[PDB]
Amino acid sequence: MQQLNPSEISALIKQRIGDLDTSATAKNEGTIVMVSDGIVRIHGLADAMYGEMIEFDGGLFGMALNLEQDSVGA
Amino acid sequence: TTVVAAAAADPAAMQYLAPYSGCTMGEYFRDRGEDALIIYDDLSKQAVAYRQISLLLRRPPGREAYPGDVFYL
Amino acid sequence: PSEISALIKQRIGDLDTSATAKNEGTIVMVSDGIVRIHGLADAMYGEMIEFDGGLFGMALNLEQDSVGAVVLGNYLSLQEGQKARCTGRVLEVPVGPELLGRVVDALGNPIDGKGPIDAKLTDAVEKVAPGVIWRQSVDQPVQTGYKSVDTMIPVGRGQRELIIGDRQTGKTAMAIDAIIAQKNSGIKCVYVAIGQKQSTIANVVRKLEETGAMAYTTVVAAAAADPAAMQYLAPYSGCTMGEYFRDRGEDALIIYDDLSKQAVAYRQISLLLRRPPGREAYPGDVFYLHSRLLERASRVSAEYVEKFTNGAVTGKTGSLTALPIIETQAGDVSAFVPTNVISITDGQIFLETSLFNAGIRPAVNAGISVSRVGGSAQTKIIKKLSGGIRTALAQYRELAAFAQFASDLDEATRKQLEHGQRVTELMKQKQYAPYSIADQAVSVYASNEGYMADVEVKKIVDFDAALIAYFRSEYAPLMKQIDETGDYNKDIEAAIKAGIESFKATQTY
Amino acid sequence: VNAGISVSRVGGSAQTKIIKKLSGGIRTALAQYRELAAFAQFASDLDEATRKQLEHGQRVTELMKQKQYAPYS
Amino acid sequence: ELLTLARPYAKAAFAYASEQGATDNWSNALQVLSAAVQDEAFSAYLNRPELTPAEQVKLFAKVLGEDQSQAVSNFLTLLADNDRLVLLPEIAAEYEQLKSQNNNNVDVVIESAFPLTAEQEQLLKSALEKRFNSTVTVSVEVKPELIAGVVIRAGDQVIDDSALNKLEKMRTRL
Amino acid sequence: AKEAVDQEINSAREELRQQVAALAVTGAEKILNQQVDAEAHNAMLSQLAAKL
Amino acid sequence: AKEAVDQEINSAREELRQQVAALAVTGAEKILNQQVDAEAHNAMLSQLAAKL
Amino acid sequence: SSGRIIQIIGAVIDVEFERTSVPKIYDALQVDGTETTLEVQQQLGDGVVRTIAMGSTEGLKRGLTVTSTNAPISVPVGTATLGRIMDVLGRPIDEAGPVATEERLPIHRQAPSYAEQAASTDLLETGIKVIDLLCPFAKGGKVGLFGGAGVGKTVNMMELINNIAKAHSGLSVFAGVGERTREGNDFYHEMKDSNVLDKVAMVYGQMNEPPGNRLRVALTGLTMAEYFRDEKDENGKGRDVLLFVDNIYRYTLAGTEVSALLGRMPSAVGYQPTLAEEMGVLQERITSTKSGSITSIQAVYVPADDLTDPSPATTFAHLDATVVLSRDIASSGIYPAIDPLDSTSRQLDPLVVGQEHYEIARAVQNVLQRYKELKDIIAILGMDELAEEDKLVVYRARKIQRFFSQPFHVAEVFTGAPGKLVPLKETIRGFKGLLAGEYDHIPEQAFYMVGGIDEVIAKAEKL
Amino acid sequence: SSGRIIQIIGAVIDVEFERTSVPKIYDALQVDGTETTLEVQQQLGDGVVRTIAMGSTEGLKRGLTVTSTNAPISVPVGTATLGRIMDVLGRPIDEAGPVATEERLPIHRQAPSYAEQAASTDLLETGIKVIDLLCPFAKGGKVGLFGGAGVGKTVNMMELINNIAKAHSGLSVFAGVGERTREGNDFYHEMKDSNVLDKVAMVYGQMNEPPGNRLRVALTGLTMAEYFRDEKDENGKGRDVLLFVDNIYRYTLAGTEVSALLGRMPSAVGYQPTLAEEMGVLQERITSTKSGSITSIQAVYVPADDLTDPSPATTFAHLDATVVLSRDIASSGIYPAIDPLDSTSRQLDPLVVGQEHYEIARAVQNVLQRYKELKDIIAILGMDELAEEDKLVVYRARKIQRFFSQPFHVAEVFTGAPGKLVPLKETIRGFKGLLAGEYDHIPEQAFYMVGGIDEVIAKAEKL
Ligand SMILES: Nc1ncnc2c1ncn2[C@@H]1O[C@H](COP(=O)(O)OP(=O)(O)OP(=O)(O)O)[C@@H](O)[C@H]1O
Ligand SMILES: Nc1ncnc2c1ncn2[C@@H]1O[C@H](COP(=O)(O)OP(=O)(O)O)[C@@H](O)[C@H]1O
Ligand SMILES: [Mg+2]
């Protein structure tokens, strides 16, 4: 029995119960789930490329390094 | 003479088990009143094979990364 | 036969009447002295938890859905499905001038079989040291009775001096001699034994009783068979009993024995609770475990003690001295626990095995033993006299590499070796026989002025013992004058020199 | 064969009486000879006892040598 | 540990049910699913290594019969992908607790030494209403092990007046 | 030695109370087991309702 | 001599424990004390229970 | 009721019972179909306990029903166990029939309280020169024989038995914990060849057995000794009890093997986090109390010739006299290989052994220490760079090192020379003369493998 | 808008907020019941934040209401904080009353950018003869005081403060990061006696507080120093502030203790992964800017006297000078006790200090490090058999060692209140003359415990 994934969130699970369409919201948009020590975990971003350049709302820039099963480290 | 061969390309399980098979083969004479003699060659390599088997099972090692029960082996 | 009846009657009629809502929980997992509970939504960190059988626990981990708690008794009588309750209390021990001469468990339970302890106060085991504003400088001496320690590594009142060295080198002997030497200084002592077999504790208690030094000492014993919680909690419960005297104007001295074993017990407790380990599998917060214990030993100003007692003890100032003991493996002082402890204390006293075998007992290593309080913790005469000893040892230690080649050297360095060997031979001392400051002063002065330069090295110890006995016999008034005050004038120096000359002339040790 | 570190905890019970009573403290003789020769490499005095022991240890050491596939009796 | 891993699923399920006004249907479905997964034979037939998550969801749909919907099917599909199907009973317990809390209804258990009649139960119900809840669900339980008195258990709060008095007096004696 | 005598006196006086209390408590439990009725049960549970 | 005196004390301790046995049987009516005294004296009804 | 097995991982079974009838921490369980006996260790909750097996776990399924006994392991005690060989569970393995006693005692018990701690200092002369001179024993105190692999712990223990137990008027208990079966057979037949078999009780959980057997085996061995201690015969006094344990290190080693399987994080090297506590719980029952005295001899293994290893370094604090063997000395031909600079004892003080003996011992240690310090200069430079006193010290120290050698009564099989038994007075007189310089004219080869000082002079004259 | 505590493990608290209102990183939370203050470290999803406690973690329940402040920890700044003693949060602890000011700044700020670095590197002169010659400081640099047994390193610090104050009216800040309370009290009393307390602000984490304190006291002191620097008075120019950190080694271990519990894997020797990040974040705000400057003096502790482990190794990248105290040099009667051969600086460069300064320093270093080599030869043979050259070296080296001695003004006892504060030009002239040989005829006892060469000439002529 493993620990909770970043994708296991009450709001996200409620949305998933709602409907499974839009293919994870157009596959090119994410949602931050974790922030710690200069690392950000995002939920979504289906079309993320290993080494891609990700832009946040504030005007910053990230870089996706871990493309895991249900989240995207950056 | 009987020769039991577990070469360097054989799976680690075969190297782990070879001396036990040899000892069982040799104990046939001992139980029936006949003397016998067995020569284990490089028990250190059996210990290395057992260390490889144990580490792949995620067992915490002791000194020199040998498993806890390398003595009982 | 009737007083017991009246007591029990009034107690039964006093209480056990009402009903009260409580916050319960259920035991789930029991293993190796660790117990987990489902429930206790109001459990406090460090709170004391009761069990159905009468045992008492302590809550350490407050997880999201479970509470991990150690057991202060023996956990072999607990089963899953039993219930636990929160008491809204904290661990407390009895304190006062009634624990003197008694041997107590880590919770203040008499184990020597001499009846109950009548203590009128209880104090919390977890406290905080007084702030930086209430302290005061360290300028009062604690005599240990060793000619080497008192002259080269002085110890004041309120200092924290470490005793560190390999196994079987005399750490416990030094601590016990320090306790014994306090017969007349009138400072109370507390000795805490952690992770020692009960036979050694009994032998130490008997030795303290033989010399009469048990009339003012309290022994806290957390033996090797006691649970890890007791070995983890013992130093704090000893420190509270010590602090009783500090906050009321009197002086105290506490000796933690084998803080390494407390660290080991706490490591065992932390590992079973699934906390992440660090270097050498210790928990990350061992430093904070030792710091909040050693930082309580201090010296408080008269204002603090006047405030604490509401004007009862106006005049005086309190103190509390600590002598933690660490053991090292093959002189490896770069390990985790010794590195942590050395950083906190105000000094250390290294005991060497190679020096112990060679006959130098005590085996104090002067090269690497320091005391940051320094000269301010010495009486006037010893402070004035220790310079010659310190410089002689320094010179003898700079060129110790050529000690076996005295035949091929000039005259100056050969004389330096000749004097250094003699001063080194001077520092030897027996066990259980401490020196008052007058004896140390006389011996050190006789060494400084070259009165030992014409006696062969093999006979220095006999010379010193005979000289001290000769002064004890002939010159009692001078000895009492020096011991009582510690002055150093031209009169005292002239008297000492005249006595030494008459001894050399007319005694023939 | 390093005569210093090699033993047979069965001892003299595992050989015929001839070899049992002939071979005495031969092993301990060589064990002491090794240390004596290592300590007295530079000895310029060489009293007669040490000289005899060193002249006997070399005899015993050179004595025990044989070739591949040369079984004695 | 199991209760910890069931927080988000239970909270999401309760939020969705409350917002859709179908809490009763989800409660029934969750109880049925918890009972089904508690079964030994059904669980053995469910954990077969050949089954994809869709197969497990379809099996749950078949065993549940009616009362199923796209919501419950999606919930089970999401659970199956992360392999958290085994912890359904904790989800059901959490959901029931949340539903009871939202309705301002707390559960109490009254344990006595003798069976109680109607007036005592009603009196105790009225007394416990001073905890200011909607209602109390009193489940009385007889215990001959006790001698006299009633012990009431509300969540983690217990009120005792029974033979525990004897133990409390014993501790004070010794 | 005199202090040891005093400690023995105190030890005996402390020891006796434990057996005395244990036997008294056991007798009390026997009395309460002998009493078997619900009127006492009913009387004090009704007491508790207002006691809340 | 201390053994002599304490072996007198203990030889009296059987009688002292008989005394306190009577006293504890009288205390056994503190099962009334625990009680709200719904049966203010329930023990007087039958006190056969034999205690030392 | 009864439970069933749900996991088998090596030697650590675990069983699931009903929610009501879970057993206690150290209860004993019996597998229905076989003779395997389980001892509960942890209680995982939800009606599941985690046990270890007192036998081989080959051929055990999952789902075998298990019944409980509601009591810890119980072994027989009394005089009926005298002259018998027994296993972990106290079942006779010498094929002499069942034991004729009815007494039972659980093997898990609390240590004696601090109030009942009687400590005595009555010297015990073993007839070994280095043991008597440097680290004297005390009747009722615990002794340990530290050493590497093959440096002679067992031979020294069998020597101390010969010098004491044969002349001892009192019972004994030998408990082998993970050692060679051949040694056990040899000891049994040696005792039976003599007539002292009626004074010993033997417990053998040896080195060929599963870790469950080697773990809870010393506990039985000293459970018998505790009963022998705390016993009184009418019109009789307590009986003095000896206790010999072999490689108590194997007791902790067998706990390390089953550590991770019980679900614990490993400690510093590989050891279990509960090393110190599980060693103290055992070691605190061996002391001697107000009634009865237990003299204990324990051989303690040292892994990889490392005295810093956590287990030997933890064992030091539990012993009164510590005898440390060295591999260098053994490889140098000196037997016994006792290191004169690491052997210590609480009995070596002037108020117990007297002034003269204490002075002789301290002088010997000082000479050996100075020689140990000079050993480095004489290697790079020559022996002729030193002064005359240093050369004299080197010669005297070599003679002292030789003079500690001695032929044991039991070692005559390996070498052939008959054994010697040297009284204490002869040792003290010989070493006093050797320090005074009276024997500076004797070659150092005359001090090797001899008894008292007279044999040295005789051997020198023969040369 | 407020959350509840849901998990307490050691000093690491967890709080669960509504998903719409979750505090940012480094926000300050105030538990409603008590005076404890938390600060956020991570965000774990579901409105859960993981924090550490600035104070007593004992007596905290679960489900205890927590309110937020929506801003980092703000501390008081201004001229009203001079002469006070304050903890991490800015609360007075000297019991002198509340701090009478309203200006506050967050303790967490970005480092100065590249553009606003100082256009030059000025030279800072103290007056101590050893430091100003061999280990010159830099205006707005960073100075470490390595090593040193129990000695007047605190005496050196208050001498430095007195010298900086009486020469320049610039303020000072003392931030004891995990300091012994005894030494802190001694320092406070000394500042109170010398009437220098009007120009010092203090912050104390007293080594027995939760690691949040020992972690953020340095940042609080640095914020106070930053405000002091950035204040522009009467011209448009900032001041020149001096900042002490009494033990920088405690700062790393304070984060090391909390690193493991926060959910980070270990590193080389068990340190946190972000050791260099934390050290850089702290140490990059101590620089000289276009307006004002902050210069710092930081005592550094080397664990086990091994400076190759990461803790001092990562500090060495930031230091501009290393003053190494020594036991022996203080023993020989040289009070300041700075090691001449070992203590070095990055500022000893002919471009910044001119050519005569550099050449004099190099010549002195060469003489000293040749005399140190002649030690064994002098000890074995004596002074007579050396060449005619290398006797002058011995005499001049002894004279130089004596001439580094200095009387300390703050002492005022056993010295005579002898404030010297010699100008650098005087020392340069003196050492040039001494190396050249104009003073070669003067007894070495004259060069002891004086200032300029005029004083040594007067002392030599008097005798
Ligand atoms: N000054 C001395 N003169 C003679 N003997 C001494 C002296 N100091 C210490 N000793 C002896 O050193 C011996 C061993 O040291 P000690 O008893 O103090 O144990 P220790 O240092 O506490 O080690 P451990 O913690 O391993 O038990 C003691 O038996 C004691 O008699
Ligand atoms: N007293 C002794 N004198 C000479 N040789 C010995 C002596 N004791 C042992 N030896 C030899 O050294 C080895 C000792 O091994 P042993 O005592 O059987 O057990 P252990 O493995 O514990 O050291 C054996 O080979 C034995 O023959
Ligand atoms: Mg000790």
Ligand SMILES: [Mg+2]
């Ligand atoms: Mg062996």
